[PDB]
Amino acid sequence: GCSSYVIINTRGTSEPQGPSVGFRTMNTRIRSAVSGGSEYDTVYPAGIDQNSAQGTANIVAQVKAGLARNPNTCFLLEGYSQGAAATCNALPQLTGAAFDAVKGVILIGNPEHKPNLACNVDGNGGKTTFSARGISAAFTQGVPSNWVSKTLDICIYGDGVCDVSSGFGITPQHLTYGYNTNVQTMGANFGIKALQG
Ligand code: NA
Phi-psi category of 169—alpha, beta or left, where left has phi over 0 and alpha has psi -120 to 50?
left
- Ligand 1 centroid to 158 CA: how many Å? 8
Cβ contact 76:13 at 8 Å? no
Q: Specify the amino acid at residue 39.
A: E
E-assigned strands of 23-170?
39-41, 74-80, 102-108, 120-121, 151-154
How many domains would you assign to the chain?
1
Alpha-carbon span 170 to 93, nearest angstrom: 28
- Ligand 1 centroid to 49 CA: how many Å? 30
- Ligand 1 centroid to 127 CA: how many Å? 9
Query: What domain range includes position 187?
Result: 1-197
Question: What Rg value do the Cα atoms of the chain yield, rounded?
Answer: 15
